[PDB]
């Protein structure tokens, strides 16, 4: 059998490729359905439940959304740093000034050091644009759409020579209650698609994942899409003999039935590459009605992005490749010895959105009126799950454990998945006490 | 394509193409940042997207394409010849594909409650 032959002849099976936290063996296991498991949807009104509202947009509403974004972030930054007042962009001033705006490029290409512009807010600058000169700036990190506060010289009123870049400030963490400290140790498994090789329809990696889930019996399993990839060669050439919907239900039934004996809860997160679903961000939950009474207690459908409380632990779930988009259009002063991923993650956490980049990638549909109400970070998450096409990693940035397990299938060979332990320690201590105690990125 | 957001200037000598929506608006719409006296306009409007989906629903609508025939005799002659009940069901499945996307989205819907009250 030539389909998935290279995958089926893998020898690296079961290998552990990354570990973080406290050293653990290979006998990773949960209690299954034992104990109390709390699964809650959190945040601005809860992570979208209905189908959607619209698919036509009004420019004077996008204008309002962008303006409000800038004003809110600027007001909070002004409160934190205790600055006196903001100066209009076009007003000449011989003394140093403090401007508030958002970063952008002056053309349709990639942003660089020479093409930076700053666009002001409506209240102060009435949406004016000025070039920014970064010759005299020592350390900086900039991407388009970043709401920023600069301090510099602007003598002529047509160009700003930036001299200081104020650092961003993140949101406060979640405040645990008395109940949340009484929860016991739990194990969580995380996987992201695609779940089949690029040359086959067999879905072998899915079966391997189901076998692993049955063996380990974790407490929660979070699965990201796509389940029917829109970029697959057979999908995009329309060689399939069945409707997309039927194939999707087939896959979903295979997943649900195969992990019935485990007793582990299942969470399904949609993707923008799901062919049968709506290709607009943010996405509503999947549609599935063929569930018995038993299965309604173990299967839960959430949106994208989502904020999920698992036993008093906050998880930030997003399927979009934000790391691969932000990193492709981000400029920085230091390139020799610096961590790109940590820097991008710091931008994500301090910008207070699930997608800070504006304008988005070329193939990325965003509805801003719903993006404003359904895609904001409520608090700084305890664990942030960010699947991406880059190499797998687990990093502790700003008190948040950011995990990238990668895709379950990469080209014609298998990928990786991730497992975590969670247990919240005692209330008092040295301020931050991460409820996540051990992470491991493992081969499939 | 519609959600890409490409804006193009209205002046024939400027024709500035951009994906970034300026926050400076004139009376008609966004104000062009290259020539400061003009308005940007969508390259692919919502009316073009709406008309495109209405076209797909129209090339598979055998129900409306039969009442459009002039004589009642010809409509009977081919309804019994090609348009079997099995054939009519096939066109209904292709028609409903374009109708799902048109159902609740794109404001082909008009809300009278907001319009009058
Ligand atoms: Zn123009």
How is the topology of this model organized?
The structure is cut from a larger assembly and holds chains A (444 residues) and B (117 residues).
Chain A: H1 5-8, E1 16-21, E2 39-41, H2 59-81, E3 93-105, E4 116-120, E5 129-133, E6 141-142, E7 147-154, E8 160-165, E9 186-192, H3 204-216, E10 220-224, H4 233-236, H5 244-258, E11 265-269, E12 299-301, E13 306-310, E14 313-317, H6 322-326, E15 331-332, H7 340-351, H8 368-374, E16 383-385, E17 393-397, E18 400-404, E19 409-410, E20 413-414, E21 416-422, E22 436-443
Parallel strand pairs in A: 5-8, 9-10, 10-11, 11-12, 14-16, 16-18
Antiparallel strand pairs in A: 1-22, 2-13, 3-4, 3-7, 4-5, 6-15, 7-8, 9-21, 13-14, 17-18, 19-20, 21-22
Chain B: E1 7-9, E2 17-18, E3 40-42, H1 46-58, H2 62-66, H3 72-79, H4 85-102, H5 112-116
Antiparallel strand pairs in B: 1-2, 1-3
Bound molecules: zinc ion.
Keywords (chain A): DNA replication, Nucleus, Phosphoprotein
GO molecular function (chain A): DNA binding
GO cellular component, one term (chain A): ciliary basal body
Describe the structure in your own words.
- The structure is cut from a larger assembly and holds chains A (444 residues) and B (117 residues).
- Chain A is an alpha/beta fold.
- Chain A is 19% helix and 25% strand.
- Helices cover 42% and strands 7% of the residues of chain B.
- Chain B contains 5 helices and 3 strands; from the N terminus they run E-E-E-H-H-H-H-H.
- Chain B has a 3-stranded antiparallel beta sheet with strand order 2-1-3, with no helix packed on it.
- In chain B, strand 1 and strand 2 form a beta hairpin.
- Chain B is elongated and about 65 Å long.
- At the A-B interface, helix 2 of A face strand 2 and helix 1 of B.
- The complex binds zinc ion (ZN).
- Zinc ion (ZN) binds next to loops of chain B.
- Chain A: This is DNA polymerase alpha subunit B.
- Chain A: Keywords: DNA replication, Nucleus, Phosphoprotein.
- Chain A: It comes from Homo sapiens (Human).
- Chain A: Belongs to the DNA polymerase alpha subunit B family.
